[PDB]
Write a protein that binds this ligand. Sequence first.
Ligand SMILES: O=C(O)c1cccc(-c2ccc(O)cc2)c1
Length: 242
Amino acid sequence: EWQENKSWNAHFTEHKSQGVVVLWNENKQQGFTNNLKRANQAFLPASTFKIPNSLIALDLGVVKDEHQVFKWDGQTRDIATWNRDHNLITAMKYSVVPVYQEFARQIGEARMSKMLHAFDYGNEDISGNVDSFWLDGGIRISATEQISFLRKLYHNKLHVSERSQRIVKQAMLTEANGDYIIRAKTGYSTRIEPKIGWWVGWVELDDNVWFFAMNMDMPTSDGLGLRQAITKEVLKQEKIIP
Ligand SMILES: O=C(O)c1cccc(-c2ccc(O)cc2)c1
């Protein structure tokens, strides 16, 4: 069911960091992690909320499809990639917060709450600003809850149209080669302590899918690449990827 392998802690220790990687074998219905305590420790989802946010916007028509353009609002922000026009694909790719803040306001406080209950998403608490609760509000989710949510999305079992779920999984596309496909979303929570990085998603193989969910303490932006680098070192160790 759930087995803990502390050997993976080296991958966090080698970099003087702390965090958890959670893997779920879909064929075997078996989970694996380095720290079962942290695996269930709930944090702010931050930009990982793009996934449910994207799903909700699409299903209500706030976003019509992955080609619709969302014009830069002309306010120059500290991240250049945000200072341009975007569609759902590029908005997800560059974690464009201002676009999803506009989604949330159009979704509305009421509808956002029901959908997150329908999704059984985390603590289902949207306390705070409707356009920032996933960055500095009351919502919390753990790695194992992320994986559980992702599993429904993969299997099109969330209570939104199949189309909306297919479109988001398209937007989640991160890496694809002859060996595997990764559909995932990054997260960086800085507005409330502790500062952490997220990476959640799954690795599609020919005959199996490995869902993953990782977070780690993130005092400075210098270690943002360790989110994927540590996850991939674990996937290699377990011969999930070469
Ligand atoms: O999580 C990602 O992949 C991603 C993408 C674009 C920008 C940022 C980011 C945001 C804020 C920051 O202070 C440092 C980095 C993260």
